[PDB]
Each structure stands twice: as C-alpha cells, then as structure tokens.
Design a protein around this ligand. Sequence first.
Ligand SMILES: O=[P-]([O-])[O-]
Lengths: 149, 249
Amino acid sequence: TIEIIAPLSGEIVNIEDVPDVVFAEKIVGDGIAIKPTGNKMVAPVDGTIGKIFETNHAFSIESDSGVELFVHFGIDTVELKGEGFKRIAEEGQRVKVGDTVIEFDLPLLEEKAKSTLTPVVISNMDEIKELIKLSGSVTVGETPVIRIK
Amino acid sequence: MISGILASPGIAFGKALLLKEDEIVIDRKKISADQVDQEVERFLSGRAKASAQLETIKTKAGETFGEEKEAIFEGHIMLLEDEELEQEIIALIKDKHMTADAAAHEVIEGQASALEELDDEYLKERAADVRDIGKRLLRNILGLKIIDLSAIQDEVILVAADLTPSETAQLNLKKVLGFITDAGGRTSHTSIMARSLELPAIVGTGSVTSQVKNDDYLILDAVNNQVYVNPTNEVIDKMRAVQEQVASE
Ligand SMILES: O=[P-]([O-])[O-]
C-alpha cells in the first residue's frame, strides 16, 4: 500500500468537479483535486521530479515505488505565464516527501486564476491495483490523500 | 526590414522548410437515397483510417513529449468517437441527404462555432483544437496527401503560417533548429513550446513564409529581430564576429 501525501494544504475535492473536461474526464489519469489554502507545493512522495512546466505551475514526479503523479495548480493557469509561482526545485531532482517544489502566491492567483482547484492525478492508471480516494482537509506534506495498492 | 514578436532569444543557421497545404474542396451536390448508404460507409471507411492514424500520433507524443501530451490526443480521439457525432453525422446524411464531407463539417463546425460565440480567449483557443479535428477529418475521407513532419532526414528550420498542437507532437525537435510562424502571438502551446524548449523562434513574422521557398538558406538573429536570406560569406563573417561578442558577454 502506497500513501500519497498531500502536495498542498486545503480541502479535498472530487476530480469530477473540476471545471475542465480533460481532468474531470480523467483523460490525464485519475486522482483528486485540492482547493488550496497554503503557499507551497511539495513532493507528495519520495521519488524524482520529472518535469516542471516552463510556467512553473505544474510538475511530474515518479515515486520510488514506481507511481507516476502529476500535480497541476489551478485551471488554465498556464495563461498567467509564471506570475505567482516560483520554481524552487529542479527537473531530475531527487526528493523526499514534503520537499518544496514550488511556491505560489495564493491571493494573487485567487484573483487572477480562472480557478485554484488543483488536480492531483495518477498518470500510471494501468499499473495500479487500486486507488482509494480520501476525504477532508489536508495539510501539506503530512496528510495522506490517496492510498494505492 | 521584417520584425516579429520574438518568443525565444538566440541565433541559428539552417535551411528553411515550407508547409504547403492545398485548399479542401467541399461538394455542395446533394446525394440520392441509393447514395445515402454508400456515403455513410465512405464516412465509416474514411473515419476508420483517421481512427488508426490518430492513434499512431498519440504514441509518438507519449514517447516524444510524455503523458502530458499523450492524453490530449485521447481527448481529441475520444471526442471524435463521441456517440453524439455518430448519430448526428449519420442523421443529416440520412435525413438531409447531404454528403459526408459537407454533413460532417457542419457537425464539428457547429460545435466549434458555438464555442466561438463565447467571450473568452481561453475558451476560443480550445475551439481551435476541436476545429482542427474536423479539418483533418475532411482530408481523411478524401484521402489527401499528408506531408508528416516526421519524414525529415536533414536538419532544417520550420516555417509555417501557423502550427496546430497535433503537429507539435509528431514534430522532430532534434532536426528542427528553430520555429518561425506568422500566427497571432501566444498561440496554443506552440509559441509556449519555444519558451519552455528554450530554442530561438518567431511567431509574429506576419508574412515571412510568403517570402521564403523550401530549401532556402536563412539565418535567424533572434537578437536584432532580423532574418538574412541568402547572405554572402562576408555578411556571415561580420555576423559571426558579433556572435563571439555575445558569447563573451
Ligand atoms: O498543461 P498546461 O496548461 O501547462
């Protein structure tokens, strides 16, 4: 059993309730969304960072346990061209749970972003036995959000 | 004196590739009842190709760029196989006795047309991706020749009026020394790709493709925002001395 730790603080939301058909229809993988309340995005697992968007608002990480995740802050946030985000980590970086990847400006994004809803999805769906979605409020790098087998 | 918006600063030297596309011809002639069954089969037979060819492009995006670009094709493919399109495309042909290329165009154009009515630049771009799916479908039914940007055996610069997300996936990054286009400016993920890829490129040229022929030798300054077409050796030597200053800087 693999526990995915919350990459940001907030409230868990259904991925189906995200205002984006590609995520809502899980074309991109399956998982949950988080209505953010903090200021930073950390590694939800021990693994290696894969790709950081040039707008520094989303990233990919592979856990050591072999799970591929994809954390994308907000909806249509690329349109802000990097405003409100600061890449803290580097592509290829090895990380442990809780390591800071990116910091963001919530209030700014709350004002400028179409939505701050943040999908956390598994992009490896075909390699996993089960995905158990959790519920509630989470605390960055502490509270588990998904359990996988 | 040609100037664009310059999306990525840098310099490059190479041949120019020109993407030429013939205009798609639509038949306004109405079909007869006996032709209703045949036109549906042509659509299914033509749709049968794009089904397998679109899937091939998806696999290239996953290995080439990653899962971030692989799933975008699944949405386009999944939308194309939407059961609403099958019934709506067939109903017009069966009900209005229209042609598959003319009837199918109305269905994809009809939805994209509704999206344009939206007063948002973000929703309008997605309508561009949906429009592209129907645009190629017409070529797939007719069976028009496709250049395919993957058939590049020599390093060249990529010049086009505008590139659709579908081309960016099946695009050879190592054989393309840069990207030049006269699109709007930000464009979908394209102009954005030059930024993230960190390669020299222009997107607001305005009319460079009409001045360039394929196999033309061009030098991209991406620093003075100028393009040199067939420059003498003395001009290159002068440009090389300036490049050395930039390296020192
Ligand atoms: O996937 P994206 O909107 O940066």
